[PDB]
Amino acid sequence: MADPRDKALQDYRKKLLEHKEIDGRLKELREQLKELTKQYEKSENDLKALQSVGQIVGEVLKQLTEEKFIVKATNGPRYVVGCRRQL
Amino acid sequence: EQDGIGEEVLKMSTEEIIQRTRLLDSEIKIMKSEVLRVTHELQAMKDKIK
């Protein structure tokens, strides 16, 4: 007759081994999630940054009125242009 | 692990029959549900990132 103490010890050891295996699986999944969260954050940032247009760089020569400025693009041409309100 | 060994030794029937088995079953069910949810979310997010 196997001792009940020995049976309980063997059952506890088997359950601990199964728990360790599932904990290893959970740790692998947690590492996967940790890496993929940052990877997806970077991918989302890249996608958001793709849809952004630049801005011409120029020099202000003179202000004609409140909402009218003379601006000289570095290319060479001079334009009469407006100004953003909260500026 | 010494505390666990002492418990499983001194209390062979008062803990293994009722306490240990139910705790292990509840834990295994909870972690299985968590693993399934995590796998589903990971698959969806991987499709999105692709």
PDB file of all heavy atoms in Angstrom, chain A residues 2 6-7 18 23 46 51 58 68 73:
ATOM      1  N   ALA A   2       0.698   2.091  -1.015  1.00  0.00           N
ATOM      2  CA  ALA A   2       1.405   3.362  -1.056  1.00  0.00           C
ATOM      3  C   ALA A   2       0.876   4.289   0.032  1.00  0.00           C
ATOM      4  O   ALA A   2      -0.332   4.377   0.263  1.00  0.00           O
ATOM      5  CB  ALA A   2       1.253   4.013  -2.430  1.00  0.00           C
ATOM      6  N   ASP A   6       2.844   9.908   0.737  1.00  0.00           N
ATOM      7  CA  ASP A   6       3.582   9.817  -0.518  1.00  0.00           C
ATOM      8  C   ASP A   6       2.688  10.148  -1.707  1.00  0.00           C
ATOM      9  O   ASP A   6       3.121  10.822  -2.649  1.00  0.00           O
ATOM     10  CB  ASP A   6       4.183   8.419  -0.672  1.00  0.00           C
ATOM     11  CG  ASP A   6       5.380   8.197   0.232  1.00  0.00           C
ATOM     12  OD1 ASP A   6       5.656   9.070   1.083  1.00  0.00           O
ATOM     13  OD2 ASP A   6       6.045   7.150   0.093  1.00  0.00           O
ATOM     14  N   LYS A   7       1.441   9.674  -1.687  1.00  0.00           N
ATOM     15  CA  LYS A   7       0.516   9.991  -2.771  1.00  0.00           C
ATOM     16  C   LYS A   7       0.285  11.493  -2.866  1.00  0.00           C
ATOM     17  O   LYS A   7       0.302  12.072  -3.959  1.00  0.00           O
ATOM     18  CB  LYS A   7      -0.811   9.261  -2.561  1.00  0.00           C
ATOM     19  CG  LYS A   7      -0.749   7.761  -2.792  1.00  0.00           C
ATOM     20  CD  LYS A   7      -2.098   7.113  -2.524  1.00  0.00           C
ATOM     21  CE  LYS A   7      -1.974   5.607  -2.372  1.00  0.00           C
ATOM     22  NZ  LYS A   7      -3.237   4.988  -1.884  1.00  0.00           N
ATOM     23  N   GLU A  18       3.155  20.938 -13.637  1.00  0.00           N
ATOM     24  CA  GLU A  18       2.207  21.466 -14.614  1.00  0.00           C
ATOM     25  C   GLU A  18       2.077  22.979 -14.487  1.00  0.00           C
ATOM     26  O   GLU A  18       2.018  23.697 -15.496  1.00  0.00           O
ATOM     27  CB  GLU A  18       0.845  20.796 -14.440  1.00  0.00           C
ATOM     28  CG  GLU A  18       0.844  19.307 -14.741  1.00  0.00           C
ATOM     29  CD  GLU A  18      -0.400  18.609 -14.226  1.00  0.00           C
ATOM     30  OE1 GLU A  18      -1.418  19.295 -14.000  1.00  0.00           O
ATOM     31  OE2 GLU A  18      -0.359  17.373 -14.050  1.00  0.00           O
ATOM     32  N   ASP A  23       3.220  28.321 -16.459  1.00  0.00           N
ATOM     33  CA  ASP A  23       3.835  29.609 -16.162  1.00  0.00           C
ATOM     34  C   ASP A  23       4.899  29.958 -17.192  1.00  0.00           C
ATOM     35  O   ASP A  23       5.063  31.127 -17.547  1.00  0.00           O
ATOM     36  CB  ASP A  23       4.438  29.594 -14.757  1.00  0.00           C
ATOM     37  CG  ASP A  23       3.470  30.088 -13.700  1.00  0.00           C
ATOM     38  OD1 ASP A  23       2.248  30.084 -13.959  1.00  0.00           O
ATOM     39  OD2 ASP A  23       3.933  30.486 -12.610  1.00  0.00           O
ATOM     40  N   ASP A  46       4.497  55.422 -37.143  1.00  0.00           N
ATOM     41  CA  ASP A  46       4.951  55.549 -38.525  1.00  0.00           C
ATOM     42  C   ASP A  46       3.781  55.830 -39.462  1.00  0.00           C
ATOM     43  O   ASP A  46       3.868  56.702 -40.338  1.00  0.00           O
ATOM     44  CB  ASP A  46       5.690  54.274 -38.937  1.00  0.00           C
ATOM     45  CG  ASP A  46       6.224  54.326 -40.360  1.00  0.00           C
ATOM     46  OD1 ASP A  46       5.606  54.977 -41.227  1.00  0.00           O
ATOM     47  OD2 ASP A  46       7.271  53.695 -40.617  1.00  0.00           O
ATOM     48  N   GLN A  51       1.212  60.546 -43.089  1.00  0.00           N
ATOM     49  CA  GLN A  51       0.230  61.512 -43.588  1.00  0.00           C
ATOM     50  C   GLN A  51       0.478  62.876 -42.944  1.00  0.00           C
ATOM     51  O   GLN A  51      -0.303  63.380 -42.136  1.00  0.00           O
ATOM     52  CB  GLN A  51      -1.189  61.021 -43.331  1.00  0.00           C
ATOM     53  CG  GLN A  51      -1.477  60.580 -41.901  1.00  0.00           C
ATOM     54  CD  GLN A  51      -2.815  59.881 -41.769  1.00  0.00           C
ATOM     55  OE1 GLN A  51      -3.578  59.787 -42.729  1.00  0.00           O
ATOM     56  NE2 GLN A  51      -3.107  59.386 -40.571  1.00  0.00           N
ATOM     57  N   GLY A  58      10.096  80.605 -45.925  1.00  0.00           N
ATOM     58  CA  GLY A  58      10.227  81.891 -46.575  1.00  0.00           C
ATOM     59  C   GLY A  58      10.641  82.967 -45.592  1.00  0.00           C
ATOM     60  O   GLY A  58      10.845  82.705 -44.405  1.00  0.00           O
ATOM     61  N   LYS A  68      -2.420  90.382 -44.141  1.00  0.00           N
ATOM     62  CA  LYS A  68      -1.758  90.407 -45.441  1.00  0.00           C
ATOM     63  C   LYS A  68      -0.281  90.686 -45.226  1.00  0.00           C
ATOM     64  O   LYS A  68       0.082  91.742 -44.699  1.00  0.00           O
ATOM     65  CB  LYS A  68      -2.382  91.464 -46.353  1.00  0.00           C
ATOM     66  CG  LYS A  68      -2.469  91.059 -47.816  1.00  0.00           C
ATOM     67  CD  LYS A  68      -3.876  91.227 -48.368  1.00  0.00           C
ATOM     68  CE  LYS A  68      -4.157  92.670 -48.741  1.00  0.00           C
ATOM     69  NZ  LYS A  68      -5.459  92.817 -49.446  1.00  0.00           N
ATOM     70  N   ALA A  73       9.646  83.444 -50.720  1.00  0.00           N
ATOM     71  CA  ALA A  73      10.106  82.068 -50.635  1.00  0.00           C
ATOM     72  C   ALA A  73      11.571  81.991 -51.043  1.00  0.00           C
ATOM     73  O   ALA A  73      12.029  82.730 -51.918  1.00  0.00           O
ATOM     74  CB  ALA A  73       9.253  81.168 -51.528  1.00  0.00           C
TER      75      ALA A  73
END
